[PDB]
């Protein structure tokens, strides 16, 4: 891979893997969501970064992801190359933002498109906070500074509120639990493992009948390598809504919410 | 990736990614499972196999390959960034089954890093019984593989050939209730190889994945775990540090797995 000419850009192609597909034998949402993981690290090295700045490292802050949104019009067959173009943008004092565009390596049209949001954290003490001017002008240099946006729309369901799912879920998945594949290298749960869980309350009969079309994901809290999940889903709606939550087995503290769309094959 | 000059053997390279590594910067053994996974589909592609791998007899006799043992030895696991070449190969057992064996090296100084091999055996895929493999059905693949032994582990008396006790209850270290998930499952809804990997070293205490790096491991594979079980990983320790596992279904105690690990202090 390779930041773009103007050097405010970053793209990388993929050759999809054998274990990456699922029964339609085209990569699964999670592939996706790994596959844009990786182009954001790799954007983030080739920028200078060994993720923090001068002024997050000395003031021990980290990025944490607050939400996630994924559309995808058609997913990559195993063995074709995906094109993912990967770019930042300052949100001003709230966070930043990352969009990602997905291509057909061979046709180049546009075959799916993710925006996510992601905000400052103390990495000790757990609090979030707004970004700081000092911190701002150390990231805005690797931006575009005019808006360049994935989803763009009037009215996108990127930036749509999501509701907590009532008491009782229609369909439920209970005792999930991290295994160390779900582990990052810092020992933390992968963001990818939270949309895992939410669509195991999905039943079979629906991942058979449709495809994934759009996933939008709140992040609340983080599951400890030592803790329990329960996945919970209502149907909420030819296109099949659903409203989801993940929540801890004991208290059913809040860990996620969202929202998934599915259409017919 | 490609087929050599021969066309005896498949060679590709892997760019190591973010989520592919561990707490100490480096693939785990997973993501070297996964590779070698990929590595062999590749080859089967390369050599004629359809996508939808069996041979033209196997497919008029419903059979296919199950791996029946796995065994996978790291020096040097490589990092996050690093590229590393797998270069894999197959060999006729007779009518035992078939072998396929891996080289791992780093792609820029080229010494080897890892080394693996598996024992794929018949079976029907509607009654799952193990057959021997037929003559037929030899002399259709015969003709991808090498002719004169080519074995990455030759030494007479190698951990590979090692048969495994049964761990006896009760065991000292216990992971209960690991369930796969969708990601866990292949493109023919079947509990992917390198699941069972992950279950077996569940049971291995954070405290000695922290102190220790993965050197050896040896899995037998005695039956598959549906979409719908619930497994248990054990563990207990045989001595460098070895270990002896057991993978069972929750309920009756029906074995899936058993194995071992070896592993070196950091
Ligand atoms: O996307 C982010 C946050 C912003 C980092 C950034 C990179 C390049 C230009 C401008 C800003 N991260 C990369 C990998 O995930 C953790 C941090
Ligand atoms: O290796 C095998 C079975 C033998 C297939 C083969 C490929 C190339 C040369 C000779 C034989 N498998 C890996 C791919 O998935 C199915 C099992």
Redesign the interface.
Known sequence: GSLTEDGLSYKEKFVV???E???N?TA?V?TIA?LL??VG??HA?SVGFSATTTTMRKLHLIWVTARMHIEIYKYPA??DVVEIETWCQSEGRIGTRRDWILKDSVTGEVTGRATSKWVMMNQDTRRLQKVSDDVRDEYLVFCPQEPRLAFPEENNRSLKKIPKLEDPAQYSMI???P???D?????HV?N?TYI??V??SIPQEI?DTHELQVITLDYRRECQQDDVVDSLTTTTSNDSQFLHLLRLSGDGQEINRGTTLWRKK
């Open positions: 893997r054998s274990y597909v699922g029964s034998k699964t999670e790994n993981q990786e690290c790799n090295q195993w063995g005792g999930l639990k295994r160390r594949a582990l990052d290298m810092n020992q992968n990818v895992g869980w669509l195991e991942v």
